């Protein structure tokens, strides 16, 4: 449907993995504590190594998400049987590349490996959400769900790994990531609600919530430490987000004006369409340099809003003669949040399959 903006979306890159030489530590622990032949679990160790190699070179598709979840769970199964966390007997170095600086960061802690895999699960879902062109209802809903899965991964990471192993996984950066992913999920839902031709007040409330998520992301992007860490990524993200704040505020007030039209509140219709046009004009100024995908969405929306405002003001001036309310006298549009971080269970046997180390006890 031509009423769908189909703006481009932000995604997060996957982190690069270094070494995690767990095999010698597991073998030493088996002989020292469990008292068994340290070579008795070579088949299990080979399975986990192959799984890691697949996880750190993950295919960029839905199957890759299942690989990361499976490996994440098997790491939980290993940690429950062999103590490889911070300060524990079988801990070995884990090295991953911090994505914004490109520098290697090492911790002797299996939960660092878990954290990075969980991060990459969120990053991969964000890529799969952003890759779709969102031409069909199914593409919109699948992208929406990918962004909710991304938020869920980043939210789980933030809550259960609360001491950041590296600055790309800090609490404030993960909060930025969750809010961006929820804003993008809500934007995809908005597109579906316009494709479905839902009621104007619902479209307005859904779009108002897109604005609220992006306002929260924008505040995080203005944080000096986030800006310094992300560098030019912060400049790029902030330009897109700031433009979308005004664009989806324009869409919200366009649909409030349509609700006013449906209720024969013809003075209120002028006020909302005027506001919508002013917001769209700001979005256009903020969109300088953006790709033609952005410019086309703005241009098509200007066709709609510019014409409806002129028609509404002419109708009120010469036919209906209703008072045009000042913007501040009307009740603001309250967002309708209909997306959420989808819950993660790292040890769900449906996603982990059988425990690789079931024999080790």
């Amino acid at each position: 449907m031509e009423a769908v903006p189909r703006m481009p979306m932000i995604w997060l890159d996957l982190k690069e993995a270094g070494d995690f030489h767990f095999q010698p530590a597991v073998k030493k622990f088996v002989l020292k504590n469990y008292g068994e032949n340290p070579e008795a679990y070579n088949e299990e160790l080979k399975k986990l190594e192959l799984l890691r190699q697949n996880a750190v070179r993950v295919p960029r598709d839905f199957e890759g998400c299942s690989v990361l979840r499976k490996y994440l769970g098997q790491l939980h199964y290993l940690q429950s049987r062999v103590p490889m966390g911070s300060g524990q007997e079988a801990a070995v170095p884990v090295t991953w590349t911090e994505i914004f600086s490109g520098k290697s960061v090492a911790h002797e802690d299996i939960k660092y490996e878990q954290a990075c895999i969980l991060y990459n699960l969120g990053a991969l879902h964000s890529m799969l959400g952003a890759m779709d062109k969102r031409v069909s209802e199914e593409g919109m809903k699948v992208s929406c769900t990918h962004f909710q899965c991304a938020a869920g991964a980043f939210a789980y990471l933030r809550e259960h790994f609360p001491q950041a192993y590296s600055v790309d996984m800090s609490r404030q950066i993960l909060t930025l990531n969750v809010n961006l992913m929820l804003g993008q999920a809500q934007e995809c839902l908005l597109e579906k609600s316009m494709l479905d031709n839902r009621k104007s007040f619902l479209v307005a409330r859904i779009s108002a919530q897109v604005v609220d998520y992006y306002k929260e992301a924008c505040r995080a992007l203005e944080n000096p430490d986030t800006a310094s860490l992300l560098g030019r990524i912060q400049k790029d993200w902030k330009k897109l987000v700031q433009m979308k704040i005004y664009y989806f505020a324009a869409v919200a007030h366009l649909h409030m004006g349509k609700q006013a039209e449906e209720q024969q509140k013809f003075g209120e219709r002028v006020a909302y369409f005027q506001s919508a046009l002013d917001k769209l004009n700001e979005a256009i100024k903020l969109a300088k340099g953006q790709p033609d995908t952005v410019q086309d969405a703005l241009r098509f929306t200007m066709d709609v809003i510019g014409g409806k405002y002129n028609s509404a003001k002419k109708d009120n001036d010469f036919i209906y003669h209703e008072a045009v309310p000042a913007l501040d006298t009307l009740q603001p549009v309250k967002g309708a949040p209909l997306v959420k971080p989808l819950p993660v269970n790292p040890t769900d046997p449906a996603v982990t399959g059988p425990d690789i180390f079931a024999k080790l006890v």
Binding site: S66, L189, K192, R198, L338, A350
Partner: peptide, 20 residues
């Protein structure tokens, strides 16, 4: 992947109930 499809399907119901 079955969990994913349920979340996708829920979106239809969320809008229907919200729209009333």
């Amino acid at each position: 992947d079955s969990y994913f499809k349920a979340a996708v399907s829920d979106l239809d119901k969320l809008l229907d109930d919200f729209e009333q």
